[PDB]
């Protein structure tokens, strides 16, 4: 009670008063208020921030920017409104002393503004000494002084003028000069510091600018505003991107985890998440802070709703009430935005953190421990939980906040509203819950459909895959017709059990899209309907739809999250077994590989025992040896007598039991197994040392790489090991031997590499480098082996038995001793429809549209003795309404449904796309499986996605633009609002559509090269280990995981950029919607502006999921337009078109013509064929043999006659060819394939193509063909549906089949089509004969490229040059040597 004696003697001037403040229509605050509450405001803000920011800012010493003349004003700034303010102090001090009473008030709230001043200037030089460019503090600060001032400006400016007002001339200006001030110093104060002394970019050009932003542009994501600008229209690709601000490179991020790690299991265990508690804890605080505000604004907005249309009922208010309303809400808005999407950022840059730390922690464990003790599979439980683990990472980062805030809200929104609609909301409540369940058991419910059908969708594919198949050799016939006819019949049976399907799913989504209405309209209506004395307001109606709005969506994403935590917690105890099997092995047994650079011995040994592991066995025991320095031991033992298990303990890879091993000089080791990395073979060769000319000649040549190199298309500069060409194990392990020996070691230890290696090679080489004469004699050489000719050369050889050493010696004694060896010797060795679609979509949202406005029309009804007139109606229309809207959805459901068949329609039109391609021209040169294999099963798969994606986004369209006419509807004045808004949403759309589409390219693109080098570098841990460079590896698989993370980084900026940029549209809407309401309260019911301002928030929720998903879903746009892209592969010039039907007499004879032929290759080539004019008159038969391929295709192609024929005539028999049936002659020629192949489908019908012929004469001719054994092949034989062009067992019963069926369609003339060529000898030896059997009355035109029975011809002309030449006497053209002769010479003489 101080202060009514504090502010005046009397205590005249009370605090807050509503009759002043309040209840008037010029409101303004009382004076002791303004004087002490107001001013406090800012200072104990300021006083409270400044040691918390002091402790942060003193760990975060970063630049020494000087004098940059901003804060040199700045301070004067500062210096001169202490020097009045404390002037203000000195005036009053003189009133006061002058005897004249002056309220305590005036001495004591001035003279804390300039301690609060003072300590700003303070506070500002420590921040320019400690170098920070942003300030995020002082901004808020001034906001609120200014904000404060202007408030005291309104009240001193208002009580100035209202009459002959009698006011001190010495605080009036003071004041103004202070506000104006302040006013010129926040303004100031906002632009930017200079830079720091020394940076960190003192090479890199490409930094990003997110290190150096003003707090405005970190706030709203300004910079990649311009990213996305410069990448719109030149494609963004390469090193545009920027490098890292070294916080999140693993080379500083990994050390601290793994030192953390390491520290916590020598202590040791509370798993990894707990020592990220310290280490990764201290970033989630913020976090945690942020999202209690966050949630705390989406509740504040329906209180003030609420009011706001309270106020609106009320027609006595003072107007300006109405304003102070709609100022806040607006306010409120923008600040949620700047708390939400700003935490979203700083959750996932965490996430990504500690992504990269595990990338890290895995490969660094996996390099250097768990020898001999990794015993899961090496690929699916090692790189797959390396790469499961760190995807999984991501999204429990995201929801790891919401289960404590997930529930909350619920709880606190129920109690509004058995707060705002009473107990029976509790009923309500039953209601909501009778909902709950409906949705997830229709998701249950739509689960089991999909899995059952994807059973069948699995059907389908299995199937389709057979197809493929049968068209990746087929050549001739037209048997695909009729079996893709049988397939579109199966595939429009699938149709139909999907018609059912998407019946299903359908109403299931967009009956639950329409939940949300029919929730509304049950709880309204048993609200309305209970007991009586409750009448429906627009308040409480209103207040409860936009909680159940605002509601809707956590009880949805509640599900999936507990079953996200329960997946990250199985995934966490692999990760946890298997960092912590630590259980360090090779810390040091030996004494180093080199401890000194000289000596007498260089591998010594005592006494050693070694075992593969604790549970088995000592596989060696008693080892005890000295070998001297630079000697050439070999060490021999029996298959299996553990030779590697002690070439590996010299390794040091065994268990060492016990024993003393000292070894001397650096080592290198080569394998029995070999390794490659892939890379170029110079790269391979080298293994990081660089060129050594010329010996890197000498290391070739004594390698006799040269035929090596030239054979291989690029020399030394073609990619090695796997994704390309293959090597031979002897070209591998020479190649191992190359590098081992270019790395120049101390000591060379080889595990038999010469296995594959030619023994004139082996030798060779043994005299080239292992050998006394090579030039690597001055070195340690050891190796193992079985082999017989070189033991007699090498120095030393030392035979080992059952883990122990048997004997010791040189060659000469231990082949005296005749015993071991000798024995060795002796038992071994040696001595329409769309339009309805539209309208129906009209309908249901006209409808919606039309029960939202007889909702409008309920509401307003005048309360008439405790009751609203009538509702009986009310409520019957308001239910005929909701029928129709579930009417409306189910039409337009089964108008999917019909786009569904529409689909089907387009099915059709693609198999029409299939029967187009029919010629295959084109398809001889062009790459054939991959393309069609993937081409036609994707478009198909994803063909179903269309009918899902075009109905969403036309639903989406047509409900904001639906929401645009309502608030249009209601005030015709806003409407000089909307198409700026409406430009700004278009532009910011167009270009995050197409700036994203490249950048998600660059993940997918990125995401593999890692995972790929862990499983290089797994697969050759062992050699990798032995050559003790690990550092570069590490190094590189560090440099190729900060390659992937570059990319990644710029699109989660983005996706929240969009968000921050489309939000305040929303706000702006709301804003406006609201002001434009307002004015025209006079004439407006409550009805109208509950609507109106109702709309606003469910508008900004409609469009921020319109942009979200129908922008990601526009990119599945892009992806169907991508699809249209794939295939636009049509316009082939072959047509099979126009026909001769003359009179068919054929075949009697078999006269031939060839005139003026210039048969060749593709076009830019030369003439294979110059104009040969050869009338090969009947009963004259032609041996054309040449080359391979040079006219017999041209013949057959030209018989082939598929493309069109408007001119070609040859006369045969007298009978020209045209004077032959076309399809009766193409078909009635019998051809034999160059390839031998069983027709696939059922054989009887393979066959009988048109089923038209006695099965008995059929019978006599395979009694006649012997030749019928993969007709016994195939399971069920003649009904057996064959598949691959009957591709499964052997050729030769193919050809047997091939002639089984030559002799089945019996024709008199068969054209011998290459069949006798690509077949062995034996087989050929057997068609001939039965050739001759059988066919000794058919007219054969043999092309045939072995001699073994080419001498039963009739008259051979040799093609030389693609010429015909000397005719008959085959001895004679033998003699002439002849072009079919030459390239029988050709093939391998000697």
Same mark, same amino acid.
């Given at each position: 009670?101080?202060?009514?004696?504090?502010?005046?003697?009397?205590?005249?001037?009370?605090?807050?008063?509503?009759?002043?403040?309040?209840?008037?229509?010029?409101?303004?605050?009382?004076?002791?208020?303004? =004087?002490?509450?107001?001013?406090?405001?800012?200072?104990?803000?300021?006083?409270?921030?400044?040691?918390?920011?002091?402790?942060?800012?003193?760990?975060?010493?970063?630049?020494?920017?000087?004098?940059?003349?901003?804060?040199?004003?700045?301070?004067?700034?500062?210096?001169?409104?202490?020097?009045?303010?404390?002037?203000?102090?000195?005036?009053?001090?003189?009133?006061?002393?002058?005897?004249?009473?002056?309220?305590?008030?005036?001495?004591?709230?001035?003279?804390?503004?300039?301690?609060?001043?003072?300590?700003?200037?303070?506070?500002?030089?420590?921040?320019?000494?400690?170098?920070?460019?942003?300030?995020?503090?002082?901004?808020?600060?001034?906001?609120?002084?200014?904000?404060?001032?202007?408030?005291?400006?309104?009240?001193?400016?208002?009580?100035?003028?209202?009459?002959?007002?009698?006011?001190?001339?010495?605080?009036?200006?003071?004041?103004?000069?202070?506000?104006?001030?302040?006013?010129?110093?926040?303004?100031?104060?906002?632009?930017?510091?200079?830079?720091?002394?020394?940076?960190?970019?003192?090479?890199?050009?490409?930094?990003?600018?997110?290190?150096?932003?003003?707090?405005?542009?970190?706030?709203?994501?300004?910079?990649?505003? /311009?990213?996305?600008?410069?990448?719109?229209?030149?494609?963004?690709?390469?090193?545009?991107?920027?490098?890292?601000?070294?916080?999140?490179?693993?080379?500083?991020?990994?050390?601290?985890?793994?030192?953390?790690?390491?520290?916590?299991?020598?202590?040791?265990?509370?798993?990894?998440?707990?020592?990220?508690?310290?280490?990764?804890?201290?970033?989630?605080?913020?976090?945690?802070?942020?999202?209690?505000?966050?949630?705390?604004?989406?509740?504040?907005?329906?209180?003030?709703?609420?009011?706001?249309?309270?106020?609106?009922?009320?027609?006595?208010?003072?107007?300006?009430?109405?304003?102070?309303?709609?100022?806040?809400?607006?306010?409120?808005?923008?600040?949620?935005?700047?708390?939400?999407?700003?935490?979203?950022?700083?959750?996932?840059?965490?996430?990504?953190?500690?992504?990269?730390?595990?990338?890290?922690?895995?490969?660094?464990?996996?390099?250097?421990?768990?020898?001999?003790?990794?015993?899961?599979?090496?690929?699916?439980?090692?790189?797959?939980?390396?790469?499961?683990?760190?995807?999984?990472?991501?999204?429990?980062?995201?929801?790891?906040?919401?289960?404590?805030?997930?529930?909350?809200?619920?709880?606190?929104?129920?109690?509004?509203?058995?707060?705002?609609?009473?107990?029976?909301?509790?009923?309500?409540?039953?209601?909501?819950?009778?909902?709950?369940?409906?949705?997830?058991?229709?998701?249950?419910?739509?689960?089991?459909?999909?899995?059952?059908?994807?059973?069948?969708?699995?059907?389908?594919?299995?199937?389709?895959?057979?197809?493929?198949?049968?068209?990746?050799?087929?050549?001739?016939?037209?048997?695909?017709?009729?079996?893709?006819?049988?397939?579109?019949?199966?595939?429009?049976?699938?149709?139909?059990?999907?018609?059912?399907?998407?019946?299903?799913?359908?109403?299931?989504?967009?009956?639950? !899209?329409?939940?949300?209405?029919?929730?509304?309209?049950?709880?309204?209506?048993?609200?309305?309907?209970?007991?009586?004395?409750?009448?429906?307001?627009?308040?409480?109606?209103?207040?409860?739809?936009?909680?159940?709005?605002?509601?809707?969506?956590?009880?949805?994403? *509640?599900?999936?999250?507990?079953?996200?935590?329960?997946?990250?917690?199985?995934?966490?105890?692999?990760?946890?077994?298997?960092?912590?099997?630590?259980?360090?092995?090779?810390?040091?047994?030996?004494?180093?590989?080199?401890?000194?650079?000289?000596?007498?011995?260089?591998?010594?040994?005592?006494?050693?025992?070694?075992?593969?592991?604790?549970?088995?066995?000592?596989?060696?025991?008693?080892?005890?040896?000295?070998?001297?320095?630079?000697? *050439?031991?070999?060490?021999?033992?029996?298959?299996?007598?553990?030779?590697?298990?002690?070439?590996?303990?010299?390794?040091?890879?065994?268990?060492?039991?016990?024993?003393?091993?000292?070894?001397?000089?650096?080592?290198?080791?080569?394998?029995?197994?070999?390794?490659?990395?892939?890379?170029?073979?110079?790269?391979?060769?080298?293994?990081?040392?660089?060129?050594?000319?010329?010996?890197?000649?000498?290391?070739?040549?004594?390698?006799?790489?040269?035929?090596?190199?030239?054979?291989?298309?690029?020399?030394?500069?073609?990619?090695?090991?796997?994704?390309?060409?293959?090597?031979?194990?002897?070209?591998?392990?020479?190649?191992?031997?190359?590098?081992?020996?270019?790395?120049?070691?101390?000591?060379?230890?080889?595990?038999?590499?010469?296995?594959?290696?030619?023994?004139?090679?082996?030798?060779?080489?043994?005299?080239?480098?292992?050998? +006394?004469?090579?030039?690597?004699?001055?070195?340690?050489?050891?190796? !193992?082996?079985?082999?017989?000719?070189?033991?007699?050369?090498?120095?030393?050889?030392?035979?080992?038995?059952?883990?122990?050493?048997?004997?010791?010696?040189?060659?000469?004694?231990?082949?005296?001793?005749?015993?071991?060896?000798?024995?060795?010797?002796?038992?071994?060795?040696?001595?329409?429809?769309?339009?309805?679609?539209?309208?129906?979509?009209?309908?249901?949202?006209?409808?919606?549209?039309?029960?939202?406005?007889?909702?409008?029309?309920?509401?307003?009804?005048?309360?008439?003795?405790?009751?609203?007139?009538?509702?009986?109606?009310?409520?019957?229309?308001?239910?005929?309404?909701?029928?129709?809207?579930?009417?409306?959805?189910?039409?337009?459901?089964?108008?999917?449904?019909?786009? /569904?068949?529409?689909?089907?329609?387009?099915?059709?039109?693609?198999?029409?796309?299939?029967?187009?391609?029919?010629?295959?021209?084109?398809?001889?040169?062009?790459?054939?499986?991959?393309?069609?294999?993937?081409?036609?099963?994707?478009?198909?798969?994803?063909?179903?996605?269309?009918?899902?994606?075009?109905?969403?986004?036309?639903?989406?369209?047509?409900?904001?633009?639906?929401?645009?006419?309502?608030?249009?509807?209601?005030?015709?004045?806003?409407?000089?609002?909307? +198409?700026?808004?409406?430009?700004?949403?278009? %532009?910011?759309?167009?270009?995050?559509?197409?700036?994203?589409?490249?950048?998600?390219?660059?993940?997918?693109?990125?995401?593999?090269?890692?995972?790929?080098?862990?499983?290089?570098?797994?697969?050759?841990?062992?050699?990798?280990?032995?050559?003790?460079?690990?550092?570069?590896?590490?190094?590189?698989?560090?440099?190729?995981?900060?390659?992937?993370?570059?990319?990644?980084?710029?699109?989660?900026?983005?996706?929240?950029?969009?968000?921050?940029?489309?939000?305040?549209?929303?706000?702006?809407?709301?804003?406006?919607?609201?002001?434009?309401?307002?004015?025209?309260?006079?004439?407006?019911?409550?009805?109208?502006?509950?609507?109106?301002?109702?709309?606003?928030?469910?508008?900004?929720?409609?469009?921020?999921?319109?942009?979200?998903?129908?922008?990601?879903?526009?990119?599945?746009?892009?992806?169907?337009?991508?699809?249209?892209?794939?295939?636009?592969?049509?316009?082939?010039?072959?047509?099979?078109?126009?026909?001769?039907?003359?009179?068919?007499?054929?075949?009697?004879?078999?006269?031939?013509?060839?005139? =003026?032929?210039?048969?060749?290759?593709?076009?830019?080539?030369? %003439?294979?064929?110059?104009?040969?004019?050869?009338?090969? =008159?009947?009963?004259?038969?032609?041996?054309?043999?040449?080359?391979?391929?040079?006219?017999?295709?041209?013949?057959?192609?030209?018989?082939?006659?598929?493309?069109?024929?408007?001119?070609?005539?040859?006369?045969?028999?007298?009978?020209?060819?045209?004077?032959?049936?076309?399809?009766? *002659?193409?078909?009635?020629?019998?051809?034999? +394939?160059?390839?031998?192949?069983?027709?696939?489908?059922?054989?009887?019908?393979?066959?009988?193509?048109?089923?038209?012929?006695?099965?008995?004469?059929?019978?006599?001719?395979?009694?006649?063909?012997?030749?019928?054994?993969?007709?016994?092949?195939?399971?069920?034989?003649?009904?057996?549906?064959?598949?691959?062009? /009957?591709?499964?067992?052997?050729?030769?019963?193919?050809?047997?089949?091939?002639?089984?069926?030559?002799?089945?369609?019996?024709?008199?003339?068969?054209?011998?089509?290459?069949?006798?060529?690509?077949?062995?000898?034996?087989?050929?030896?057997?068609?001939?004969?039965?050739?001759?059997?059988?066919?000794?009355?058919?007219?054969?035109?043999?092309?045939?490229?072995?001699?073994?029975?080419?001498?039963?011809?009739?008259?051979?002309?040799?093609?030389?040059?693609?010429?015909?030449?000397?005719?008959?006497? +085959?001895?004679?053209?033998?003699?002439?040597?002849?072009?079919?002769?030459?390239?029988?010479?050709?093939?391998?003489?000697?």
């Amino acid at each position: 009670m101080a202060l009514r004696g504090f502010c005046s003697a009397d205590g005249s001037d009370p605090l807050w008063d509503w009759n002043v403040t309040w209840n008037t229509s010029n409101p303004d605050f009382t004076k002791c208020f303004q =004087n002490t509450v107001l001013v406090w405001v800012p200072c104990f803000y300021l006083w409270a921030c400044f040691p918390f920011y002091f402790l942060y800012l003193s760990r975060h010493d970063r630049g020494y920017i000087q004098m940059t003349p901003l804060n040199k004003t700045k301070t004067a700034l500062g210096f001169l409104l202490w020097i009045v303010c404390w002037a203000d102090l000195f005036y009053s001090f003189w009133e006061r002393s002058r005897g004249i009473f002056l309220a305590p008030v005036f001495l004591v709230s001035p003279t804390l503004l300039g301690i609060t001043m003072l300590l700003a200037t303070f506070l500002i030089q420590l921040e320019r000494r400690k170098g920070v460019q942003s300030s995020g503090i002082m901004l808020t600060f001034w906001l609120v002084a200014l904000v404060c001032a202007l408030a005291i400006l309104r009240s001193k400016i208002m009580t100035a003028l209202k009459e002959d007002a009698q006011v001190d001339l010495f605080r009036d200006i003071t004041f103004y000069v202070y506000f104006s001030l302040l006013l010129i110093q926040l303004v100031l104060s906002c632009f930017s510091d200079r830079s720091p002394l020394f940076s960190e970019t003192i090479h890199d050009p490409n930094p990003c600018p997110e290190s150096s932003a003003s707090f405005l542009s970190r706030i709203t994501f300004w910079w990649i505003t /311009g990213l996305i600008v410069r990448g719109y229209r030149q494609p963004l690709e390469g090193s545009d991107l920027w490098s890292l601000n070294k916080e999140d490179t693993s080379e500083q991020v990994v050390p601290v985890l793994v030192k953390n790690w390491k520290k916590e299991c020598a202590k040791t265990n509370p798993s990894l998440f707990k020592v990220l508690y310290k280490t990764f804890g201290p970033y989630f605080l913020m976090s945690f802070f942020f999202k209690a505000i966050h949630d705390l604004m989406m509740f504040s907005g329906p209180q003030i709703l609420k009011l706001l249309i309270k106020f609106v009922n009320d027609t006595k208010a003072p107007d300006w009430q109405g304003y102070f309303y709609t100022v806040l809400l607006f306010v409120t808005a923008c600040l949620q935005t700047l708390v939400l999407h700003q935490y979203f950022h700083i959750c996932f840059v965490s996430g990504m953190r500690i992504k990269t730390a595990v990338i890290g922690a895995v490969y660094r464990k996996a390099l250097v421990i768990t020898n001999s003790a990794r015993k899961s599979s090496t690929v699916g439980e090692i790189v797959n939980l390396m790469s499961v683990d760190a995807q999984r990472f991501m999204d429990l980062a995201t929801y790891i906040n919401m289960i404590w805030s997930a529930p909350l809200q619920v709880i606190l929104a129920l109690y509004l509203l058995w707060l705002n609609l009473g107990p029976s909301v509790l009923a309500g409540v039953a209601v909501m819950v009778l909902m709950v369940p409906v949705n997830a058991v229709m998701a249950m419910k739509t689960k089991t459909y999909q899995v059952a059908h994807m059973k069948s969708k699995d059907n389908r594919i299995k199937l389709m895959n057979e197809i493929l198949n049968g068209i990746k050799v087929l050549k001739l016939y037209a048997w695909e017709l009729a079996f893709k006819d049988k397939v579109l019949a199966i595939r429009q049976e699938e149709l139909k059990v999907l018609k059912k399907s998407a019946y299903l799913s359908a109403v299931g989504t967009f009956t639950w !899209v329409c939940t949300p209405f029919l929730v509304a309209l049950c709880t309204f209506a048993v609200y309305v309907t209970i007991d009586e004395n409750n009448i429906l307001d627009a308040q409480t109606a209103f207040v409860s739809l936009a909680l159940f709005n605002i509601l809707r969506f956590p009880l949805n994403i *509640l599900p999936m999250v507990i079953s996200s935590i329960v997946q990250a917690s199985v995934s966490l105890k692999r990760l946890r077994i298997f960092l912590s099997h630590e259980e360090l092995e090779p810390d040091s047994i030996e004494r180093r590989p080199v401890k000194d650079g000289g000596g007498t011995n260089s591998i010594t040994v005592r006494n050693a025992t070694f075992t593969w592991a604790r549970s088995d066995p000592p596989t060696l025991n008693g080892i005890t040896f000295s070998i001297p320095e630079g000697a *050439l031991v070999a060490v021999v033992g029996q298959v299996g007598c553990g030779k590697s298990s002690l070439l590996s303990a010299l390794l040091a890879e065994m268990d060492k039991v016990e024993g003393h091993v000292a070894i001397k000089g650096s080592v290198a080791y080569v394998p029995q197994q070999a390794w490659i990395q892939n890379d170029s073979l110079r790269e391979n060769i080298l293994f990081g040392c660089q060129l050594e000319e010329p010996y890197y000649r000498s290391v070739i040549q004594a390698c006799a790489l040269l035929p090596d190199l030239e054979i291989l298309p690029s020399g030394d500069r073609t990619e090695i090991g796997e994704k390309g060409v293959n090597l031979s194990g002897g070209q591998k392990q020479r190649v191992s031997l190359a590098r081992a020996v270019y790395s120049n070691a101390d000591i060379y230890l080889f595990d038999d590499p010469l296995s594959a290696v030619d023994a004139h090679v082996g030798k060779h080489i043994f005299e080239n480098v292992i050998g +006394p004469k090579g030039m690597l004699k001055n070195k340690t050489r050891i190796l !193992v082996t079985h082999s017989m000719s070189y033991l007699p050369q090498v120095d030393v050889i030392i035979v080992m038995s059952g883990g122990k050493i048997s004997e010791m010696g040189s060659y000469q004694e231990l082949l005296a001793r005749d015993g071991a060896f000798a024995e060795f010797l002796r038992t071994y060795a040696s001595t329409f429809i769309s339009f309805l679609s539209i309208f129906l979509f009209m309908c249901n949202h006209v409808s919606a549209l039309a029960s939202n406005y007889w909702l409008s029309l309920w509401t307003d009804d005048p309360i008439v003795n405790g009751t609203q007139e009538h509702t009986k109606v009310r409520l019957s229309v308001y239910g005929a309404l909701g029928i129709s809207q579930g009417i409306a959805v189910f039409g337009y459901s089964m108008a999917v449904s019909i786009g /569904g068949i529409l689909a089907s329609r387009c099915l059709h039109v693609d198999l029409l796309h299939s029967i187009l391609r029919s010629p295959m021209s084109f398809f001889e040169r062009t790459p054939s499986g991959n393309l069609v294999n993937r081409f036609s099963k994707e478009l198909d798969t994803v063909d179903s996605m269309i009918p899902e994606v075009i109905k969403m986004f036309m639903g989406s369209l047509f409900n904001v633009i639906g929401a645009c006419i309502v608030i249009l509807l209601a005030t015709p004045i806003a409407a000089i609002i909307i +198409p700026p808004l409406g430009l700004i949403y278009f %532009f910011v759309q167009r270009f995050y559509v197409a700036s994203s589409r490249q950048l998600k390219r660059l993940e997918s693109v990125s995401r593999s090269p890692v995972y790929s080098h862990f499983n290089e570098t797994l697969l050759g841990v062992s050699v990798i280990r032995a050559f003790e460079e690990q550092e570069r590896f590490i190094h590189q698989s560090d440099l190729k995981v900060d390659e992937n993370q570059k990319a990644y980084y710029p699109s989660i900026v983005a996706n929240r950029w969009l968000a921050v940029r489309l939000e305040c549209v929303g706000n702006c809407i709301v804003l406006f919607a609201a002001l434009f309401a307002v004015i025209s309260r006079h004439s407006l019911s409550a009805g109208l502006v509950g609507l109106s301002v109702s709309y606003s928030l469910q508008v900004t929720t409609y469009l921020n999921w319109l942009v979200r998903m129908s922008s990601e879903m526009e990119t599945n746009i892009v992806a169907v337009e991508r699809l249209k892209e794939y295939s636009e592969t049509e316009k082939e010039a072959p047509w099979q078109i126009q026909e001769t039907a003359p009179p068919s007499s054929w075949p009697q004879v078999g006269r031939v013509e060839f005139r =003026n032929y210039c048969l060749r290759y593709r076009e830019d080539l030369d %003439f294979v064929l110059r104009h040969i004019n050869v009338t090969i =008159n009947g009963g004259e038969k032609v041996g054309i043999v040449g080359r391979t391929g040079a006219g017999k295709s041209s013949l057959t192609l030209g018989l082939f006659r598929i493309n069109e024929s408007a001119e070609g005539e040859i006369i045969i028999d007298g009978i020209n060819i045209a004077k032959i049936g076309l399809h009766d *002659l193409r078909f009635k020629i019998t051809i034999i +394939p160059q390839d031998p192949v069983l027709f696939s489908g059922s054989l009887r019908m393979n066959l009988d193509p048109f089923s038209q012929y006695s099965d008995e004469e059929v019978w006599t001719s395979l009694e006649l063909a012997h030749l019928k054994d993969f007709v016994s092949a195939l399971p069920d034989k003649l009904d057996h549906e064959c598949a691959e062009g /009957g591709e499964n067992l052997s050729v030769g019963q193919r050809q047997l089949v091939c002639l089984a069926r030559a002799l089945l369609r019996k024709t008199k003339i068969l054209v011998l089509d290459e069949a006798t060529a690509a077949v062995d000898l034996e087989t050929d030896d057997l068609i001939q004969s039965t050739i001759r059997t059988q066919f000794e009355d058919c007219t054969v035109l043999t092309i045939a490229h072995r001699l073994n029975t080419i001498m039963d011809y009739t008259r051979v002309i040799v093609l030389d040059k693609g010429e015909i030449q000397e005719y008959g006497a +085959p001895s004679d053209l033998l003699q002439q040597r002849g072009l079919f002769y030459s390239m029988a010479k050709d093939a391998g003489l000697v």
